[PDB]
Amino acid sequence: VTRIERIGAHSHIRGLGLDDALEPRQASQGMVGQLAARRAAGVVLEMIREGKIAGRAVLIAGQPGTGKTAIAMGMAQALGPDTPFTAIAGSEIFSLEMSKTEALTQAFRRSIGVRIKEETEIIEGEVVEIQIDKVGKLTLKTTEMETIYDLGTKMIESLTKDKVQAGDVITIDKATGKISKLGRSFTRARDYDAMGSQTKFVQCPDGELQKRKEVVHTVSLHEIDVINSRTQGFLALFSGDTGEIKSEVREQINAKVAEWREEGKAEIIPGVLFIDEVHMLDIESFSFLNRALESDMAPVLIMATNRGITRIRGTSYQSPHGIPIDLLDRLLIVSTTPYSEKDTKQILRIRCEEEDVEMSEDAYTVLTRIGLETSLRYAIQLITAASLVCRKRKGTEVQVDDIKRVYSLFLDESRSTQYMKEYQ
């Protein structure tokens, strides 16, 4: 059976391969080599799990194919679903309905988790009879007890607007919303022809009628969208408002979350914001981050740029990493070193093990020698390519000849630029 998330580029990264003392192992769970960069990743991951401070930023820099996104995915996988890890690209902010600043604001607020716990007394039971004359009575039922309730004006109005019939397992809370939870217990045989799209006959509840329902759910600090309109939950599934007013975003929601945390009804859990390829950001977003990192409850940023001394978009000034120095000053730069003949073959072997490709030692050697001359991801793709070419060859073990067949079939950037002599 095939799942939605089959093996991809970084599927082999099943967490960050460190020790109890953050010491990087040579061969570990997915990650390989890059000892210093991986130890720095573990340090920032511990700083994350701590969450005592805000406004931290680490920038992983290195040549393309050194494992920046690999370390990012390792940190993401090591940071369980408990805390949010919002991984956005460097171009997911250039929106048409949102400005280049509200996008970063929403991304920040999305990386701050909040575990809400709610308690409520609930009445649940099968409705036996509803008499009405206005005032009336209601006979709820459960295998443990059967009761009587006198209904008031609002109760009767809600009951009539919900059209609850006999046998329906009604559910009533204080400050009655009157959730018609389940369908009918009895009065079956409607399946003879049809059932309502909302009918879920499942049997009548057991146990006591009244109960205390404690419900815990993890939301994000972006819940301002859940207030920014009349029907708010709807705007949470699509683009939504162009931008929620600051006069509410930055004061009202924050104060209410503080009150919740003081009363003990909720608790904030900061997360991580991984902005990949941040070199595309304009100087405006960088000047915004300059102050955003100064705020009180900002998440920790993880940037991954592969550009050296290059021009900053929107301007003509060259700078390291292609971003402003006033922003680089507030970061913490880690460096990833290029892989060697020893590490390239190791990660290639791990990638072969991923899809369970049995490769010979000569094939491993030749593929490593190829990838050390052209590119790493090129040799990674050659793994699956040769695997398929040999599976069609009625083979079981990929060999040097099948690897060279693919090497000749599929070109790389270098050989393609070389063969581009015709100039159409």
Coil/strand/helix, residue 364: helix
> From the list another protein, ligand ADP, none, which binds 310 (C-beta under 5 to 8 Å, kind-based)?
none
Question: Closest approach of Cβ 72 to ligand ADP, in Å?
Answer: 7
Q: Find where tokens 């649940």 sit.
A: 124
Question: Closest approach of Cβ 176 to another protein, in Å?
Answer: 17
User: Residue 297 belongs to what H/E stretch?
Assistant: none
* Rg (the chain; Cα; Å): 29
67 is annotated as contributing to ligand binding: yes
Query: Per-residue contact track with ligand ADP, 68 to 107, x per CB under 6 A?
Result: xxx-------------------------------------
Angle at 97 between CA 96 and CA 99, to 5 degrees: 80
62 is annotated as contributing to ligand binding: yes
Considering the complex, state which of residue 9 and residue 179 has its C-beta at the smaller distance from ligand ADP. 9
How far, CA to CA in Å, does 14 sit from each of 70, 71, 77? 10, 11, 6
Stretch that binds ligand ADP, among 9-17, 89-97, 228-236, 383-391 (CB under 6 A): 9-17
What number of other Cβ atoms are within 10 A of residue 158's Cβ? Answer: 16
Judged by CB under 8 A, the chain residues 31 through 60 that form the site for another protein are none
Structure tokens that stand for 185 in this block: 């217990």
Read off the amino acid at residue 145.
M
Asked if 148 is part of the footprint of another protein (rule: CB under 8 A), the reply reads yes
Structure tokens that stand for 285 in this block: 């977003």
Question: Closest approach of Cβ 391 to ligand ADP, in Å?
Answer: 22
Asked if 33 is part of the footprint of ligand ADP (rule: CB under 6 A), the reply reads yes
Asked if 30 is part of the footprint of ligand ADP (rule: CB under 6 A), the reply reads yes
Stretch that binds another protein, among 34-42, 104-112, 140-148, 386-394 (CB under 8 A): 140-148
Residue from 9, 27, 145, 245 binding another protein (CB under 8 A): 145
Considering the complex, state which of residue 25 and residue 134 has its C-beta at the smaller distance from ligand ADP. 25
Residue 175 per-residue DSSP state: S
Stretch that binds ligand ADP, among 42-50, 185-193, 220-228, 375-383 (CB under 6 A): 375-383
Considering the complex, state which of residue 73 and residue 104 has its C-beta at the smaller distance from ligand ADP. 73
Structure tokens that stand for 286 in this block: 């960088």
Asked if 65 is part of the footprint of ligand ADP (rule: CB under 6 A), the reply reads yes
Asked if 139 is part of the footprint of another protein (rule: CB under 8 A), the reply reads yes
> From the list ligand ADP, another protein, none, which binds 380 (C-beta under 5 to 8 Å, kind-based)?
ligand ADP
Beta strands in 258-348 (DSSP E): 266-270, 272-276, 300-305, 310-311, 318-319, 332-335
**Rounded-to-integer distance, Cα 420 and Cα 417, Å:** 5
Binding residues with another protein: total (CB under 8 A): 8
Instruction: Name the pairing type of β-strands 85-89 and 210-220.
Output: unpaired
Asked if 397 is part of the footprint of another protein (rule: CB under 8 A), the reply reads no
17 is annotated as contributing to ligand binding: no
Residues 6 or more apart whose Cβ sits within 8 Å of residue 133: none
Stretch that binds ligand ADP, among 59-67, 129-137, 237-245, 361-369 (CB under 6 A): 59-67
- DSSP calls for 227-267: TSSSSHHHHTSS---S---HHHIIIIIHHHHHHHHHHTSEE
Question: Closest approach of Cβ 254 to another protein, in Å?
Answer: 42
- DSSP calls for 150-162: EE-HHHHHHHHHH
**Rounded-to-integer distance, Cα 212 and Cα 377, Å:** 55
* Binding site feature residues for ATP: 62-69
* Binding site feature residues: 62-69
What is the binding site for ligand ADP (CB under 6 A)?
Answer: 9-10, 12, 30-34, 64-70, 347, 350-351, 376-377, 380
What is the binding site for another protein (CB under 8 A)?
Answer: 128, 139, 145-149, 210
